[PDB]
Every structure is written in C-alpha cells, then in structure tokens.
Write a protein that binds this ligand. Structure first.
Ligand SMILES: *[C@@H]1O[C@H](CO)[C@@H](O[C@@H]2O[C@H](CO)[C@@H](O[C@@H]3O[C@H](CO)[C@@H](O)[C@H](O[C@H]4O[C@H](CO)[C@@H](O)[C@H](O)[C@@H]4O[C@H]4O[C@H](CO)[C@@H](O)[C@H](O)[C@@H]4O)[C@@H]3O)[C@H](O)[C@H]2NC(C)=O)[C@H](O)[C@H]1NC(C)=O
Ligand SMILES: *[C@@H]1O[C@H](CO)[C@@H](O[C@@H]2O[C@H](CO)[C@@H](O[C@@H]3O[C@H](CO[C@H]4O[C@H](CO)[C@@H](O)[C@H](O)[C@@H]4O)[C@@H](O)[C@H](O[C@H]4O[C@H](CO)[C@@H](O)[C@H](O)[C@@H]4O)[C@@H]3O)[C@H](O)[C@H]2NC(C)=O)[C@H](O)[C@H]1NC(C)=O
Ligand SMILES: *[C@@H]1O[C@H](CO[C@@H]2O[C@@H](C)[C@@H](O)[C@@H](O)[C@@H]2O)[C@@H](O[C@@H]2O[C@H](CO)[C@@H](O)[C@H](O)[C@H]2NC(C)=O)[C@H](O)[C@H]1NC(C)=O
Ligand SMILES: *[C@@H]1O[C@H](CO)[C@@H](O[C@@H]2O[C@H](CO)[C@@H](O)[C@H](O)[C@H]2NC(C)=O)[C@H](O)[C@H]1NC(C)=O
Ligand SMILES: *[C@@H]1O[C@H](CO)[C@@H](O[C@@H]2O[C@H](CO)[C@@H](O)[C@H](O)[C@H]2NC(C)=O)[C@H](O)[C@H]1NC(C)=O
Ligand SMILES: *[C@@H]1O[C@H](CO)[C@@H](O)[C@H](O)[C@H]1NC(C)=O
Ligand SMILES: *[C@@H]1O[C@H](CO)[C@@H](O)[C@H](O)[C@H]1NC(C)=O
Ligand SMILES: *[C@@H]1O[C@H](CO)[C@@H](O)[C@H](O)[C@H]1NC(C)=O
Ligand SMILES: *[C@@H]1O[C@H](CO)[C@@H](O)[C@H](O)[C@H]1NC(C)=O
Ligand SMILES: *[C@@H]1O[C@H](CO)[C@@H](O)[C@H](O)[C@H]1NC(C)=O
Ligand SMILES: *[C@@H]1O[C@H](CO)[C@@H](O)[C@H](O)[C@H]1NC(C)=O
Ligand SMILES: *[C@@H]1O[C@H](CO)[C@@H](O)[C@H](O)[C@H]1NC(C)=O
Ligand SMILES: *[C@@H]1O[C@H](CO)[C@@H](O)[C@H](O)[C@H]1NC(C)=O
Ligand SMILES: *[C@@H]1O[C@H](CO)[C@@H](O)[C@H](O)[C@H]1NC(C)=O
Ligand SMILES: *[C@@H]1O[C@H](CO)[C@@H](O)[C@H](O)[C@H]1NC(C)=O
Ligand SMILES: *[C@@H]1O[C@H](CO)[C@@H](O)[C@H](O)[C@H]1NC(C)=O
Ligand SMILES: *[C@@H]1O[C@H](CO)[C@@H](O)[C@H](O)[C@H]1NC(C)=O
Ligand SMILES: *[C@@H]1O[C@H](CO)[C@@H](O)[C@H](O)[C@H]1NC(C)=O
Lengths: 561, 123, 107, 129, 102, 50, 50
C-alpha cells in the first residue's frame, strides 16, 4: 500500500509556447523573391499522427505562427531587395505631359539625370503612372517620385520573381505542431479531432488586400471567423466553399529602356507605348459572385440574428489603403473593388463584373514608411486567372449591419491558412506514484497514464536534438541543446540519467494526491495528472534532490569501509 | 525648448476669412513639417495641413484642400488662412512642429505644440 | 481618409491600478501609431511614437504596442498626474487622423 | 458530472420506447454508458454496456433481441469536459417490464473494472398497462 | 580493436568568416555527440562503452561464426557487410530490450 | 555547454558518470607521489595537489 | 601535432574530387572580399585622364 515516487522521461504532455519554426519547401526555384536557398527541403512523408482521445483548445487569434510568418515574409523581402540598385539620383524634378489616349493616367516625363561617372548630365524621357508622380508645385507640369521626399527608392532586380511558392513551417526539436482536423472548426475553441504533424501543408505567401486569393477552400461550407465577433473592431475572415475565378488583365504592351545610373547599374523604365491605350481590368463571373454573397449572408444571419445585411464599398483615399491589391505576373495591380460590395440583401448589368484597375510601380509594402520598391516594367500583356478564395470583411444603425471590404494587416491572410495549426512545447518530465521503491509521436497523449508510458521512447527519440536566418537557427539549436541538457541534469541530480523510467525511494505524500493507483494510472491522462500536481512540482523535485541522493551519496561513500 | 504661440481673432463671421498666425519664440521655422490641427469642442482632433520649412511645399487634408492655405511669413512665424469658415468650424486651433527625420526622439509625431487658440464662428 | 476609433470612450480607475486604452484603425498602419496625453485647457504632448517607442521624459509606467489595426496603450501604477484625455494618431498615411479620445478620471 | 434521463412514460403492452440519457461534466467518449433495469417486482438486473468510443456493445443474453443501443458523437465544451447523449430502444414491452431504468457513467478508462457503473442518473419510470 | 574504444571516444568533443563557421562546427559536433548519447540512453547504454542486448543474431544478416567475425575482419569491413541491414538492427533494439524490459 | 559535456564525457568513459566520488581499479604509482594518505589528505589543498 | 600512423590501413585518395580544395578556395575568396570591403571605393575616378 505504501507508494513511491517514480520519474518518467518522455511524458506526452505539452504547454502552449511561442518559438521559432523551420522553413521547408519542395526543392523541385532560383532567383525567387522568397530566397528558397534559406529553406530546407521537405520530407516527402507527411507524418500526420492522429491523436486519439485528445481534444485541444485552438485560438487562431493568438497563434504565434502568424507573427513568425509575417516576420519571415518581411525578412525574405528585405533580403531579396537588399542586393539591388538604389534609385538615389531619381529624385530630380520631372517635366511631364499627359499621354492622350485612361485620360491622363500615363505621363510622359522628361528629366535630367546626373551620375557617379559625372561625364555629363543626361536628359531622358520616361513614362510613369499617375499614382507614382506627385505634383510638386502649382505649375501643372512639375512632378516628383511619390516616395522621393521620404526615402531613397530601391529598384527591384528584374531577375527576382514574385511568384508565390508554397512554404511549409516545421517544428524545431523540442516542440510539436498540432493541427485541427474538425471540418467545421470556427478558429476558436475546442477541437475534437487533433493530429500532430512535422510540417504544415504548403502555404502560398500571396500578398493581397480585401480578397484572399488561391490558398485553400473550405471542406463543407462557407465559414465566417472572428474573435469576439460582436465587436466591430475585429477582422472577419471568410473562407469560401468554392473559389471564384478572377481574370485580371493589363492589356498595354509597352517597351522597356535602360538608363545607366553608374557602373554596372541602370534604372529600368518604360519607353514608348506600342498599340492602343486600354484600361487594366478584372473580370469576375456575376452568377458565381451572387452565390458567394448568398452563402456569406446566410452564414452572417446565423450569428447577427435575422437582420438586414448590407455590403458597402471602401471610402475614398490613397489606392494602397482602400482598393484591392495583388501582384500577379510581377506587376502590381490595384483594383476598385466597388462593383462587388454594393448590394442590399434585407430578408442585370450583364453577366460579367468588370472592375477597373490601375497599375502602380512605387509600392510602400508591409504598411511601412521610409522604404519603397520600384517594380521594373514588364514588357508584355499580364494575365492573372487567379482563384478568389475567401474575403476579409470589417463591420461598422436602423436595424442594418454595414459590412465593408477591409482587414487589419497581412497577418490576416496568414491566419486564413494558419487557423488550424498550433505550436506547443513538450514537457517530457513527469512524476507519478508506483508500488515499488528503488504508435507515433504523442500517440498515447489522450490515453490513460497506464499504457502511455510504453511509448516514452518515441518522445525521447524524436523531439530532442553568414546569413541572419542562419544565426537565428543557430540560436534555436543552442537553446534546444540547453533545454535537453537541463532535463538531463535534472535526471542527473535525481540519479535518473541512465534510463527512461527511474524509480526512487522517497515516499508519496498523500497531501500531493490522496488517490489510489487505479485512480492515477487509469482514469487520468498524463496532462490531467501533471495539472493536478502542478502546484507541488517545485516541492516534489526538491525532495527528489534531497531525498535518496545527497543522503544516498553520503551512504555510498561509506560502503567501501 | 522651442515654444509656439497662436495669435489671431477670436470671433469670425460665417462668410469671411479666418487668419491665424503661429509665432516661434526660442527657435525659427526650421526644416520640419509645420502644421495646424483642429479640435472642435467635445470632439477629437483633425488635421488641417502642413507646410515644409525646407521649401514652399505644402499639403492639406483633401476635405479642406480647397479652403485652407498655409504659408510662412517671417523666418519666425507661419500662418493658416481658411476661407469660407462655417459654424461647424468653431474649434480650438493648434499649431505645431511635426518631426520627420527618424534619428530624433520623435520619428513621426507632432512633437512641439502651441498653447491653442479657441476660435468661435458667430455673428 | 483612414477613420479612427477608440475604446472605452470614458474610463475611470483608482490610483495604483493598471488600465488599457485601445485605439482602432479601419485599415492597417503597421507600427505608425502615436499616442498623446492632453490635459484640460492645454495642448497635448506625445507619449508614444511608433506604436511602442516611448518619448524621453515619460516614465516607464506608460507602455504600448500592437500592429495592424488594433493597438493598445497600457498605463501601469496609475498616478493622479495621469488624469486627462488620451488621443491616438496615425502617421502612416495622410491625412494623419486622430481618434475621438478617451477621458481618464482618477479616483 | 451529471447524467440526465427523460421523464416517466406510460406505454401499452406491445409498444416500444426509446430512452435517452444525456451527459455533461465529463468526457462522453471516455467512459461506458451502462443501462440497468430496476425491476419493480424482482430487483435490479443488468441490461447492457455501450462504449461511445468504438461502439462496442455487450448485452445480457435475456435482452440480446430486446435492446438496441446507439450513441451520438460528443460535442466538446472545454478541454476536459464535453456533453453528449446515448439512446436505448426497447421493443415488445410486456407487463413484466414495468420498472425504473437507469444509465450510469463507467468507472474507469482502463483496468479490470472499466465496465462497472459509477455515476448514476436519477432513473426513468416506465409503466406498462 | 575493441580494446581501444575509449581512444576514439575521447576525440568526439573539443562575427567574421571563421567565427561563425567555428561556432556552427562546435554546435554541430555537440548535436552529433548528444544524438549518439540519446540513442544509447534509449538503449540503456548511456553509461556503458559496450553493452549486450536481448536481440538474437539473425543468420540472414551474416552467416558467419564468431571466429569469422572477431578475427580476419576489420571494423570497416564489418560495417560495410551489414550496412544494408544496419537500420534493421537498431529497430529491433528499440522494439525489444527496454521497450519490454521496463 | 561545451565544458559541461567535456566533463560528462570524461566521467562517462572512466565509469563514473553518476558519482561525485568514484573508485577505480588502477593502482597508485609511487612515482606520481610518494606520500602517505595523511600527508596528502590532511596537508595539501586541492590546488597544490593538482 | 599528434600524427598517428595507421597500421594495416590502405585508403583510396582522389585529389581531383577533394572537398578540402573547394572549401579552401571558398574561404580564400570570402576572406579577401571581407578584407577589402571596409576600404576606399574609387568611384569619383571614372574621369578622362590626360
Ligand atoms: C557622474 O555622476 C553624476 C551624479 O549623478 C552625474 O550627474 C547626472 O548627470 C545626468 C546627465 O545630465 C543628470 O540627469 C539629467 O538631470 C536633469 C535634471 O534637470 C534632467 O532634466 C535630464 O533629463 C533629460 O535628459 C535625460 C537624458 O537624455 C532624458 O532621459 C530625460 O528625458 C531628459 O531629456 C530632455 O533633455 C534632453 C537633452 O539632451 C533631450 O534630448 C530630451 O528631448 C528632453 O528634452 C537628466 O535626467 C543628473 O541630474 C546628474 N545628477 C546630479 C546629481 O546632478 C554625471 O553625469 C556623471 N558624470 C559623467 C561624466 O557622466
Ligand atoms: C481512448 O480512450 C478509450 C477510453 O477512454 C480507450 O478505450 C478503452 O481501451 C481499453 C484498452 O483497450 C479498454 O480496456 C478493456 O481491456 C480488457 C482487458 O485488458 C484490461 O484488463 C486486463 C485484465 O482485466 C488487464 O491486464 C489489462 O491491463 C487491462 O486493464 C478487455 O478485455 C476489454 O475488452 C472489451 O473491449 C474489446 C474491444 O474490442 C472487445 O473486443 C471485448 O469484447 C470487450 O468488449 C477492454 O478492451 C477499455 O474498456 C476501453 N474503454 C472504452 C470506454 O471503450 C481507447 O483505447 C483509447 N484510445 C487509445 C488509442 O488508447
Ligand atoms: C475518474 O475520473 C472521473 C472524472 O473526473 C476526473 O477525476 C476527478 C477525480 C478530477 O480530477 C477531475 O478533474 C477529472 O476529470 C471522476 O468522477 C467525477 O468526475 C467529475 C469530473 O468529470 C468530478 O467533478 C467529480 O467530483 C467526480 N466524482 C466522483 C463522485 O468521484 C472519478 O471519481 C475518477 N476516479 C475513479 C472513478 O476512480
Ligand atoms: C480526424 O483527422 C484525421 C486526419 O488526421 C482524419 O483521417 C483522415 O481521413 C481522410 C478521409 O478521407 C483520409 O483520406 C486520411 O488518410 C485520414 N488520415 C489519417 C492520418 O488517418 C479523420 O478522418 C478525422 N476524423 C474525424 C473528422 O472524425
Ligand atoms: C514621349 O516624349 C518623347 C519626347 O518628348 C517622345 O519622343 C519623340 O518621339 C517622336 C516620334 O515621332 C520623335 O520624332 C522625337 O524625336 C522623339 N523625341 C525625343 C526627345 O526622344 C516620345 O515619343 C513620347 N512618347 C509618348 C508615348 O508619348
Ligand atoms: C535639365 O532638366 C531640368 C528638368 O527638366 C531642367 O529644368 C533643366 O533646364 C535641364 N537642363 C539642361 C541643361 O537641359
Ligand atoms: C482554381 O480552381 C480551379 C477549378 O477547376 C482549379 O482547377 C485550379 O487548380 C484552381 N487554382 C488555384 C490556383 O487554386
Ligand atoms: C466583446 O465585445 C463586447 C462589446 O460590448 C464586450 O462587452 C465583451 O466583453 C467583449 N468580449 C470579449 C470576449 O472580448
Ligand atoms: C499587345 O500586344 C499583343 C500581341 O499579341 C496584342 O494582341 C494586343 O492587342 C496588344 N495590346 C493592345 C492594347 O493593343
Ligand atoms: C472582360 O469582359 C469584357 C466584357 O466586355 C470583355 O470585353 C473583356 O475582353 C474581358 N476580359 C478578359 C480578360 O477576358
Ligand atoms: C478566365 O479565363 C479562363 C482561361 O484562362 C476561362 O476559361 C474562364 O472562363 C475565364 N473566366 C472569366 C470569368 O472570364
Ligand atoms: C454606405 O452605404 C450607404 C447606403 O446604405 C451609402 O449612402 C454610403 O455612401 C456608403 N458609404 C460609402 C463610404 O460610400
Ligand atoms: C470606383 O468606381 C466608382 C464608380 O462610380 C467611383 O465612383 C469610385 O470613385 C471608384 N473608386 C476608386 C477608389 O477609384
Ligand atoms: C450600386 O448598384 C446600383 C445598381 O446597379 C448602381 O446604380 C449604383 O450606382 C451602384 N453604386 C456604386 C457606388 O457603384
Ligand atoms: C444574380 O445574377 C443574375 C444574372 O443574370 C441577376 O439577374 C440577378 O439579379 C442577380 N441577383 C442577385 C441577388 O445578386
Ligand atoms: C494551483 O494554482 C492555480 C492557479 O495558478 C489554482 O487555480 C489551483 O487551484 C491551484 N491548485 C492547488 C491544488 O493548489
Ligand atoms: C577474411 O576477409 C577476406 C576479405 O576478402 C574474405 O574473403 C575472407 O573470407 C575472410 N575470412 C573470414 C574467416 O571471414
Ligand atoms: C581638367 O584637366 C585638364 C587637363 O587634362 C585641364 O586642362 C582642364 O582645365 C581641367 N578642367 C578644369 C575645369 O579645371
């Protein structure tokens, strides 16, 4: 009846934690904006270990993988743009004339460029979009680069492709990634079907506003997610059941000219326009959009009561803030997105919705100031043919709720894919009473303590053990090693370093848990047990150090005599 | 420490021009964004506009761009001229210095404020 | 123009507690949100620059942060000197609009 | 934990009844649901065990034809608690079947005694006449 | 050769171009040593240079007597002969021994 | 970390990984120190001995 | 310098596929670029010489 403390190493118990994840991809490109050489190849085997008898609490709005992804996305963009020509001298005043077709959208500007060579000051002509040039004086023929007054504009290297490539996040040693497989998971709350993965599915890092593109579709129906949901100040992420095809075109061809800035470096701009001037535009099928709004309104009605639902467009302002944005083909498109959110549902202008679009070359990306990118002109017709997969809606009084296209920041897109993933820290050390004194990873996490220790080996085998990303990974590896050694030193001072299950000779105190072994090894899982005695963990460990050992080491010294 | 002081008429008619000056005491109109911001009673604040001390370049809020002109007069004084001032424009007007150079404490925040002049539109 | 809101519109707390004021943007601004403190009858002074960067001379009791559209100002160990109206301003894009302001009464 | 049963019913001989048992305060899929008959004229006797996790059933020989047991899935409310329900359909009622039917939560997830009932409901009276 | 295991065991340990490369080499050497120690700890040999397990020898791996293994062959030749079966032996050690002995 | 593992490796090979006081089978060679145990243990500090 | 001669060891060497050569060449280039980097850039001298 007298019970003794036993230490188990490799216990399938975890705590919520924030860490740095590894970057994996399908090796299959070169000169990609996402710098694929900084990511490792993925393992063709997806792993995917289903956790039986495990229900976990997921919260997409507190998911650290979203902040990590946003940081990595920004870092990769800055790394990709760093080795490119900076447009230091292109701050000179530009003498512009309108191009007569888009009436005044494209301006033909003459300007005088100085160089580092200083052989001569050269006069050049170039075409720019209305959104890139800002009138600097009352004179209606003086203009300057939009970003000149605040920063030096960095030109993107034409060799850099902006095509999104799937990115997988993989758990570092010492951590695990859980995935919620509930078909109707709402992004917040318990999930009854949870699996553990090594790497997430591929995430396309598509940069867009208001409408989510490509990504992934909902399995059963349109699902509308938010945090408080009653609060107006939350981003509403709508994941669609079926995608809507959007065909965006930039019909103008143009030509590309190089104006040398210095040795080995040049500014790439548009020369002469070939063909007619035609407005860039996007075509969305009207009937499919009808069905998308019908489904969204139905799902909104279920949570906001049977009120009138109205979709309004954004207010006037800078096109980078209030208009839809995307970058297919390596060109940067902004579209009005106002022929889509202009309807009242309560309770035919053709069969295709054609949205006007505008092209901008100087982009202040990632909601930052002081840095800007100049996108070199592409020389052909730009086709998109992308899949609209989910919306970002915001909410703003006579019995009507007003919804508008909108969003927070780019993290709202990552949540759209990352809502089902969670990162957890594994705590392999557990302590339990026993009678005697001195499947897959987490497969038994939901099982009772009995018959879950027979898989401790798995947690012990797996889980443990000049670029900036390289140094950050180095720090992560050092921290993982330090963590493993902290566990090994705890086993050392307890005399347990030589085996996974270490039996001690310190009695179990009924004040810690006044329960029979059947109440402990059966009935409870390891997580419930570790929670039950959490408040005494620091006390229990002290006795393991002070009992047996120290007293036992002293006893060991005198056995020779 | 740079100090600013608003000066101008307290009462303006519904149809005439509003003219407010902002003097600089321990300083001058340096190469910062010198700006005006409006605060109606009981409301928050709204931007009126700014003039860059480097040149004569100005910028104004689009909703007021066609009525407000901000200029620099003396090296130590700048002013806001707002035409066709309506009853809705009664407010406390503040002038200030907006920092934009990153290497200072403020990177982008109205750093120097005046004391504020309360302007009432009435007959 | 980016529209700004703030919550709660009316706040009160006793001396020594910790309070939070949340400033909300219709559109994301990165970290470019400033915080100001206005005393009744006086012009405001800035407390926080780029969302989290505190002005010299302001004690460490004033903390803040956030990104995108939802930002917070946290005032630890609330003092009688903290009575006043707090404001938030976006510097990301012109016009640099302000929220309606939160009145903080000290009890 | 709490086990809640439907109210008492009066049935004619030859009729069938379906008795529900709803659960809360514990994980439904972790424990057996035990159906036991309290016979008005004989005393208690066992009717059957149903495992919501896998659907495994164990009926007493007397009731192998009389009892059909089904369950729904669990709906989690927290990480350690969920609600749910189980149903038992009894066919061909006779006057001898008048009595109180109880559902109970199984004692353990593992061990030799998992099957035993531990948390009992209030009991539903079935009258045949 | 098995009498010199310690001699090889002792040599597993010990911001510019060389600094970061040296730090990477040190961390990777630590990771290699710790991985070998983790494998031994699972096998229950972490405190032992030579340990005997409960897994019998399968004649399909090498149909040779001990005189044919402990003499004549070098450790290099031995690891080559069972290289294609090496992953199988480790599996049995984890599948058996401590996994059941515990 | 490197120093801790070097010490643990040395203790692991000797046969002393779990002990602060570990006895070996190697006899003491009088040429290393021709002194009685009382001359060593009750006179020298660990630094002079090292 | 240590230097332990291995008895009964014959080893196949190939100087034409030796990774040490590629690594030394990479290190020499990297070191030279790092050394020259913090030095004067003669950009004002792209002028015509008489
Ligand atoms: C050796 O020890 C002696 C004794 O302590 C040191 O003396 C102290 O020196 C410091 C440095 O000046 C001084 O601290 C200042 O006290 C002033 C009292 O009026 C404060 O006004 C001043 O605050 C400003 O500066 C701080 C530092 O930048 C800021 O944190 C603070 O917000 C204030 O900033 C204002 O002014 C700066 C001007 O640069 C401006 O940038 C800001 O925008 C803002 O307007 C300091 O706290 C102590 O008072 C001195 N102590 C005593 C007892 O006199 C001495 O400095 C040491 N010796 C040496 C060689 O360093
Ligand atoms: C998810 O969680 C559920 C419960 O929450 C688990 O289901 C339980 O699983 C255990 C183990 O399978 C079931 O235990 C029963 O074990 C009996 C024999 O083993 C026990 O008893 C012997 C001696 O008494 C001990 O030596 C031994 O250690 C065990 O304590 C079996 O005879 C029982 O058989 C019954 O079920 C099987 C299943 O097909 C039938 O074939 C039999 O006819 C009979 O009905 C039984 O297996 C326990 O009863 C299960 N509980 C429930 C409520 O279903 C899941 O296993 C767990 N998931 C995972 C992956 O671990
Ligand atoms: C076996 O577990 C059930 C479920 O509760 C668990 O164990 C408790 C002791 C406690 O640690 C809970 O947090 C665990 O989830 C016990 O039965 C009842 O369980 C509920 C919670 O579902 C609890 O509030 C009741 O007090 C428990 N009631 C009784 C009368 O015991 C059960 O007791 C446990 N032990 C056995 C069967 O031996
Ligand atoms: C719980 O999630 C797992 C996935 O981890 C689901 O199992 C998959 O089911 C699909 C059904 O088409 C199979 O194609 C996959 O191969 C299964 N994967 C694995 C790893 O088993 C399981 O069905 C889900 N259960 C639910 C929702 O009840
Ligand atoms: C933009 O302006 C330049 C010069 O203002 C135009 O270039 C001229 O094109 C005509 C075409 O017949 C030539 O004869 C001139 O010699 C060119 N002048 C110079 C200075 O290059 C250019 O065609 C204009 N492009 C557009 C699209 O309007
Ligand atoms: C150079 O270009 C600028 C801008 O158009 C113009 O003002 C200036 O006169 C030009 N100078 C010469 C020498 O062409
Ligand atoms: C878009 O939808 C079509 C539907 O047939 C599908 O074939 C295509 O792969 C989808 N494209 C993307 C990028 O998801
Ligand atoms: C949701 O918003 C309402 C607005 O009144 C607030 O009272 C409530 O506490 C919020 N809930 C959460 C969970 O944030
Ligand atoms: C651009 O060039 C293509 C070449 O096939 C042509 O079909 C197209 O019409 C051109 N664009 C315009 C606007 O004329
Ligand atoms: C979009 O629809 C319009 C309808 O007039 C059509 O003329 C145009 O060619 C379509 N664009 C594309 C890219 O298919
Ligand atoms: C978009 O283009 C594809 C071919 O790329 C075509 O099959 C599809 O019907 C078009 N859809 C719309 C809405 O114009
Ligand atoms: C919002 O919708 C109303 C009609 O419901 C309309 O009058 C108003 O102008 C819309 N908002 C904007 C910013 O256009
Ligand atoms: C979108 O199109 C409508 C058409 O009436 C126009 O009024 C509105 O200004 C456009 N918006 C933008 C941001 O270009
Ligand atoms: C909304 O749709 C109606 C019906 O076609 C149209 O008259 C109205 O101008 C549209 N509004 C906008 C802002 O485009
Ligand atoms: C849906 O699209 C059809 C296309 O002909 C149009 O007639 C209908 O009015 C639209 N309905 C709604 C509710 O948007
Ligand atoms: C342990 O601490 C938590 C708060 O961290 C408390 O809610 C719980 O009741 C405590 N448990 C015991 C057994 O003292
Ligand atoms: C000794 O090694 C040689 C290597 O070729 C081999 O042919 C021979 O059979 C080996 N002898 C034994 C006894 O294993
Ligand atoms: C440039 O150098 C030449 C000698 O090569 C000299 O004749 C000429 O005057 C110099 N130019 C100036 C502006 O001093």
């Amino acid at each position: 009846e007298k019970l003794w403390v036993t230490v188990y190493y490799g216990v399938p118990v975890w705590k919520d934690a924030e860490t740095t994840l590894f970057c994996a991809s399908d090796a299959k490109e070169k000169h990609n904006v996402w710098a694929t050489h900084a990511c490792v190849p993925t393992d063709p085997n997806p792993q995917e270990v289903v956790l039986e008898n495990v229900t976990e609490h997921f919260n997409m709005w507190k998911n650290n993988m979203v902040e990590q992804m946003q940081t990595d996305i920004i870092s990769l963009w800055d790394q990709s743009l760093k080795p490119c020509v900076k447009l230091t001298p292109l701050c000179v005043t530009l003498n512009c004339k309108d191009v007569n077709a888009e009436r005044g959208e494209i301006k033909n500007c003459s300007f005088n460029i100085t160089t580092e060579l200083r052989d001569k000051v050269q006069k050049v002509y170039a075409l720019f979009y209305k959104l890139d040039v800002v009138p600097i004086d009352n004179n209606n023929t003086s203009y300057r680069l939009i970003s000149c007054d605040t920063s030096v504009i960095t030109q993107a290297c034409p060799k850099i492709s902006f095509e999104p490539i799937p990115i997988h996040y993989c758990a570092p040693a010492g951590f695990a990634i859980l995935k919620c497989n509930d078909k109707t998971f709402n992004g917040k709350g318990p999930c009854k079907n949870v699996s553990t993965v090594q790497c997430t599915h591929g995430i396309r890092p598509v940069v867009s506003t208001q409408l989510l593109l490509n990504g992934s579709l909902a399995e059963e129906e349109v699902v509308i997610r938010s945090d408080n949901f009653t609060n107006n100040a939350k981003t509403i992420i709508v994941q669609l059941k079926e995608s809507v095809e959007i065909n965006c075109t930039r019909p103008n061809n143009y030509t590309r000219k190089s104006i040398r800035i210095g040795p080995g470096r040049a500014f790439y701009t548009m020369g002469e326009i070939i063909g007619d001037i035609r407005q860039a535009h996007c075509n969305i099928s009207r009937a499919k959009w009808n069905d998308t709004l019908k489904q969204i309104v139905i799902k909104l009605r279920e949570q906001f009561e049977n009120k009138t639902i109205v979709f309004n467009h954004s207010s006037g302002g800078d096109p980078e803030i209030v208009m839809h944005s995307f970058n297919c083909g390596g060109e940067f498109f902004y579209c009005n997105s106002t022929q889509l959110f202009n309807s009242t549902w309560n309770n035919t202008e053709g069969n295709t919705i054609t949205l006007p679009c505008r092209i901008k070359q100087i982009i202040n990306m990632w909601q930052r100031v002081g840095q800007a990118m100049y996108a070199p002109p592409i020389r052909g017709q730009i086709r998109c043919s992308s899949n609209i997969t989910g919306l970002l809606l915001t909410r703003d009084e006579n019995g009507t709720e007003i919804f508008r296209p909108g969003g927070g920041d780019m993290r709202d897109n990552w949540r759209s894919e990352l809502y089902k993933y969670k990162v957890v820290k594994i705590e392999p050390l557990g302590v339990a009473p026993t009678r005697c004194k001195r499947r897959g990873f987490l497969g038994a996490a939901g099982s009772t303590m009995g018959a879950a220790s027979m898989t401790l080996t798995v947690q012990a085998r797996n889980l443990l053990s000049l670029g900036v990303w390289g140094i950050k990974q180095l720090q992560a590896r050092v921290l993982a090693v330090e963590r493993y050694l902290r566990d090994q030193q705890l086993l050392g001072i307890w005399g347990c370093s030589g085996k996974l299950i270490c039996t001690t000779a310190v009695p179990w105190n009924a004040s810690w848990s006044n329960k029979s072994l059947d109440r402990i090894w059966n009935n409870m899982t390891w997580m419930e047990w570790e929670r039950e005695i959490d408040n005494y963990t620091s006390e229990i460990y002290t006795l393991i150090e002070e009992s047996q050992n120290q007293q036992e080491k002293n006893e060991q010294e005198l056995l020779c005599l | 420490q740079v100090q600013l002081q608003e000066s101008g008429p307290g009462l303006v008619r519904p149809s005439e021009t509003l003219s407010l000056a902002c003097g600089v005491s321990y300083g001058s109109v340096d190469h910062y964004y010198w700006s005006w911001v409006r605060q109606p009673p009981g409301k928050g604040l709204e931007w009126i506009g700014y003039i860059d001390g480097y040149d004569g370049a100005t910028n104004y809020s689009p909703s007021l761009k066609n009525r407000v002109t901000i200029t620099i007069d003396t090296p130590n004084q700048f002013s806001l001229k707002m035409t066709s001032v309506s009853a809705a424009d009664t407010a406390v007007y503040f002038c200030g210095r907006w920092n934009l150079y990153d290497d200072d404490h403020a990177y982008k925040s109205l750093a120097v404020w005046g004391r504020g002049i309360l302007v009432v539109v009435s007959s | 123009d980016i529209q700004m809101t703030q919550s709660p519109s009316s706040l009160s707390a006793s001396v020594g507690d910790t309070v939070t004021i949340t400033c909300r943007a219709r559109h994301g601004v990165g970290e470019n949100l400033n915080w100001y403190q206005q005393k009744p009858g006086k012009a405001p002074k800035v407390l926080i620059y780029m969302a989290s960067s505190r002005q010299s001379g302001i004690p460490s009791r004033f903390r803040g942060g956030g990104s995108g559209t939802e930002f917070t100002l946290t005032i630890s160990s609330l003092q009688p000197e903290d009575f006043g109206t707090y404001h938030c301003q976006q510097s990301y894009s012109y016009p640099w609009t302000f929220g309606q302001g939160t009145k903080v009464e000290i009890k | 934990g709490q086990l809640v049963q439907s109210g008492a019913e009066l049935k004619k001989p030859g009729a069938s009844v379906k008795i529900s048992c709803k659960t809360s305060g514990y994980r439904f899929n972790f424990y057996h649901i035990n159906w036991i008959r309290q016979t008005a004229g004989r005393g208690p006797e066992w009717m059957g065990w149903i495992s919501p996790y896998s659907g495994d059933k164990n009926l007493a020989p007397a009731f192998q034809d009389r009892v059909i047991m089904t369950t729904d899935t669990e709906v989690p409310v927290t990480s350690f608690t969920s609600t749910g329900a189980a149903y038992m359909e009894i066919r061909n009622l006779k006057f001898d079947d008048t009595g109180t039917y109880f559902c109970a939560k199984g004692l353990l997830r593992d061990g030799s005694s998992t099957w035993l009932p531990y948390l009992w409901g209030q009991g539903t009276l079935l009258t045949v006449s």
